[PDB]
Amino acid sequence: RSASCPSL
Amino acid sequence: RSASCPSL
Amino acid sequence: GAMGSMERASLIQKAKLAEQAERYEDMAAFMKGAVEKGEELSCEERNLLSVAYKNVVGGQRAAWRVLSSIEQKSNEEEKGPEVREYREKVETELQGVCDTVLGLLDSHLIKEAGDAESRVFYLKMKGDYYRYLAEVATGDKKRIIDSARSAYQEAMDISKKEMPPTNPIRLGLALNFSVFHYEIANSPEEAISLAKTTFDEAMADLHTLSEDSYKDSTLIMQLLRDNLTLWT
Amino acid sequence: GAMGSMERASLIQKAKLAEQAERYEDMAAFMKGAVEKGEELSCEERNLLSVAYKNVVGGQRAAWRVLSSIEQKSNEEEKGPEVREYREKVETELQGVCDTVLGLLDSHLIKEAGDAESRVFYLKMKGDYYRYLAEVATGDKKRIIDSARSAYQEAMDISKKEMPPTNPIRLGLALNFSVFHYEIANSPEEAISLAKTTFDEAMADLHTLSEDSYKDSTLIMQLLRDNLTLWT
Ligand SMILES: *C[C@@H](C*)C(=O)OCC
Ligand SMILES: *C[C@@H](C*)C(=O)OCC
Ligand SMILES: [Cl-]
Ligand SMILES: [Cl-]
Ligand SMILES: [Cl-]
Ligand SMILES: [Cl-]
Ligand SMILES: [Cl-]
Ligand SMILES: [Cl-]
Ligand SMILES: [Mg+2]
Ligand SMILES: [Mg+2]
């Protein structure tokens, strides 16, 4: 799975 | 801290 | 609301405490409370709002994926309605949290946002929360997908005019929009092209940054590169 | 109840799904539902009950400690009532979960438990939930401490008569009772003596076990030894 922008 | 019995 | 009797500054203080205790659900309720006071949010406040809800929704999305996967495996021995019921339960809660965030954006965070920083921030948030709705949508998926695209594109237009290419939110917006293209809109080529051009334009602007700004931009740039390595 | 309309077997199935999705709060509500059907729990069901609530309460205990520590640091610049208010909020929820578990044990899990396995299990649970109340008690701490001790001692008496020394629940009971002595009752010597004698008696009974039983006992034995290394 692609990584989205993490919390932060 | 002391370890208690973990969940399992 | 339940937070209607608490001071704005007290809600913000409690949100920071909830963050330290990893009580993200409490953190989210405090920040909803803060937003409903009707004053514009500072940069630090927007960040708290964002962290609270991303963590709450993050937990629900992960559970949902675990359950969908068990459900799909069962549609290859008959086990009754329980898997579908529970998946629907988690899904419904997920949709309520997304509906809460989008309601806040619509009443009245977005329309009061005049500065590029705040406006981009709120439009990106809107894109992300429609994207999360899209991940679980089956029967309306098309309108949801288009609402996501439209919020992301509007944010991209402002970020391109008003912000330098290394600005962390401009970068994080592009990363999330590229994930939208790849995972939701079925456009891997659009995804790869956006990630590459975003990375290249930031690279060429690193020289303008202080060491601290430099560290913030390059962290997001690494995630763009990680996805490009996955997608290619 | 809210679970009163769902089948017992459906609640158990959903509890297992909630466990896989790490939705411990849902898992706890399903298992409460299952218990309130009024039938005795099997071994696997008791385990689900135990995992659900230990995880829910585990999260609250960790938040509480984070907050108490901030609160104590503030009683060494004046910041207002927020830290105390929030600590009290988390504390109150923690006490409600413990009160829920102890209510279930009292209506009617313990009194229906005839076999040593079930009875020890339920009494240990009772000890642990009073121990968690004791961790946060200030003004009644003494009665709470004594209710914990009394449940643990009753379980220890049955476990010593009815179970082999390597039985995982006998071992886990002794470990938790030793932590009670060390962290709650202020009796580090009692703690060390119980841990040592428990470890030694299990060691001498390992030879009777299959390879699988052997692996289960030795895991708990390592935690006894880890505490002994900390306490000595
Ligand atoms: C991760 C979020 C979308 C963002 O842009 O953060 C800036 C560091
Ligand atoms: C951890 C719990 C108290 C217990 O005894 O588990 C048996 C493995
Ligand atoms: Cl939470
Ligand atoms: Cl359900
Ligand atoms: Cl829009
Ligand atoms: Cl949970
Ligand atoms: Cl509070
Ligand atoms: Cl008792
Ligand atoms: Mg078959
Ligand atoms: Mg001072």
Side-chain angles (χ1 to χ4, degrees), chain A residues 2-7, chain B residues 2-7, chain C residues 1-24 26-71 74-78 80-111 113-139 141 143-195 197-200 202-211 213-214 216-224 226-232, chain D residues 1-24 26-71 74-78 80-111 113-139 141 143-195 197-200 202-211 213-214 216-224 226-232:
Chain A
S2 317
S4 64
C5 183
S7 304
Chain B
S2 317
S4 64
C5 183
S7 304
Chain C
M3 298 299 172
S5 64
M6 200 183 314
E7 291 282 12
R8 189 179 187 282
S10 295
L11 291 161
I12 302 299
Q13 190 179 346
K14 283 180 191 179
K16 294 176 182 153
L17 289 173
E19 182 183 24
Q20 284 174 75
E22 297 173 55
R23 296 266 290 182
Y24 293 115
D26 287 351
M27 195 190 176
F30 296 134
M31 285 317 299
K32 184 179 194 295
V35 166
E36 286 174 355
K37 297 296 172 197
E39 308 279 4
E40 291 181 49
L41 306 199
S42 68
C43 179
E44 183 182 18
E45 292 164 359
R46 290 189 304 258
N47 184 67
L48 291 166
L49 178 68
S50 164
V51 164
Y53 279 101
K54 284 303 178 76
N55 274 276
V56 169
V57 84
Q60 298 166 324
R61 293 164 64 213
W64 184 94
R65 285 185 294 258
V66 163
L67 297 176
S68 303
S69 158
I70 293 159
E71 195 183 7
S74 79
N75 304 317
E76 286 180 343
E77 193 64 45
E78 175 60 54
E82 288 91 351
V83 170
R84 178 189 50 74
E85 287 169 347
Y86 187 51
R87 191 267 296 142
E88 288 176 355
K89 176 189 176 163
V90 170
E91 192 170 293
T92 294
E93 290 185 2
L94 194 167
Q95 285 164 329
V97 171
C98 299
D99 289 346
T100 297
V101 171
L102 295 168
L104 290 179
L105 291 175
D106 195 43
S107 306
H108 291 99
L109 298 179
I110 284 168
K111 72 171 57 58
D115 294 353
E117 219 74 37
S118 67
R119 189 160 190 92
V120 168
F121 182 90
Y122 291 126
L123 284 165
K124 179 188 168 202
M125 188 167 289
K126 184 180 188 164
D128 289 345
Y129 284 85
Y130 276 114
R131 173 155 64 85
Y132 303 149
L133 289 175
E135 293 175 338
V136 306
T138 46
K141 192 182 172 67
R143 266 181 275 276
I144 289 175
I145 284 169
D146 194 65
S147 302
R149 188 191 309 287
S150 163
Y152 279 137
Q153 187 52 247
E154 194 169 340
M156 287 285 302
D157 297 342
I158 293 148
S159 71
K160 289 205 196 81
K161 279 159 189 157
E162 297 297 345
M163 288 170 170
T166 47
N167 183 286
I169 211 263
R170 168 159 179 197
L171 286 177
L173 166 63
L175 170 62
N176 284 7
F177 192 17
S178 72
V179 168
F180 169 81
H181 289 307
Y182 191 90
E183 297 283 355
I184 298 301
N186 203 60
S187 313
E189 289 183 344
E190 187 74 15
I192 293 167
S193 173
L194 174 64
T197 61
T198 302
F199 181 100
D200 290 345
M203 187 58 54
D205 189 72
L206 283 179
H207 72 89
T208 62
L209 301 191
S210 66
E211 173 174 313
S213 301
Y214 176 92
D216 295 338
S217 308
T218 61
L219 203 179
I220 313 312
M221 279 169 77
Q222 184 62 64
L223 301 174
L224 287 164
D226 296 342
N227 288 340
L228 282 167
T229 297
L230 187 69
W231 298 341
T232 68
Chain D
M3 298 299 172
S5 64
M6 200 183 314
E7 291 282 12
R8 189 179 187 282
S10 295
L11 291 161
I12 302 299
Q13 190 179 346
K14 283 180 191 179
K16 294 176 182 153
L17 289 173
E19 182 183 24
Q20 284 174 75
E22 297 173 55
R23 296 266 290 182
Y24 293 115
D26 287 351
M27 195 190 176
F30 296 134
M31 285 317 299
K32 184 179 194 295
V35 166
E36 286 174 355
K37 297 296 172 197
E39 308 279 4
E40 291 181 49
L41 306 199
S42 68
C43 179
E44 183 182 18
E45 292 164 359
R46 290 189 304 258
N47 184 67
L48 291 166
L49 178 68
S50 164
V51 164
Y53 279 101
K54 284 303 178 76
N55 274 276
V56 169
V57 84
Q60 298 166 324
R61 293 164 64 213
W64 184 94
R65 285 185 294 258
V66 163
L67 297 176
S68 303
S69 158
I70 293 159
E71 195 183 7
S74 79
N75 304 317
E76 286 180 343
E77 193 64 45
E78 175 60 54
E82 288 91 351
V83 170
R84 178 189 50 74
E85 287 169 347
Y86 187 51
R87 191 267 296 142
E88 288 176 355
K89 176 189 176 163
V90 170
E91 192 170 293
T92 294
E93 290 185 2
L94 194 167
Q95 285 164 329
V97 171
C98 299
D99 289 346
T100 297
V101 171
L102 295 168
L104 290 179
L105 291 175
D106 195 43
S107 306
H108 291 99
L109 298 179
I110 284 168
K111 72 171 57 58
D115 294 353
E117 219 74 37
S118 67
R119 189 160 190 92
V120 168
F121 182 90
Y122 291 126
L123 284 165
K124 179 188 168 202
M125 188 167 289
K126 184 180 188 164
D128 289 345
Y129 284 85
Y130 276 114
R131 173 155 64 85
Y132 303 149
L133 289 175
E135 293 175 338
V136 306
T138 46
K141 192 182 172 67
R143 266 181 275 276
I144 289 175
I145 284 169
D146 194 65
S147 302
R149 188 191 309 287
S150 163
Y152 279 137
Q153 187 52 247
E154 194 169 340
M156 287 285 302
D157 297 342
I158 293 148
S159 71
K160 289 205 196 81
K161 279 159 189 157
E162 297 297 345
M163 288 170 170
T166 47
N167 183 286
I169 211 263
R170 168 159 179 197
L171 286 177
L173 166 63
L175 170 62
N176 284 7
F177 192 17
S178 72
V179 168
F180 169 81
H181 289 307
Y182 191 90
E183 297 283 355
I184 298 301
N186 203 60
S187 313
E189 289 183 344
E190 187 74 15
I192 293 167
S193 173
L194 174 64
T197 61
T198 302
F199 181 100
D200 290 345
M203 187 58 54
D205 189 72
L206 283 179
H207 72 89
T208 62
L209 301 191
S210 66
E211 173 174 313
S213 301
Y214 176 92
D216 295 338
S217 308
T218 61
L219 203 179
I220 313 312
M221 279 169 77
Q222 184 62 64
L223 301 174
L224 287 164
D226 296 342
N227 288 340
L228 282 167
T229 297
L230 187 69
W231 298 341
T232 68

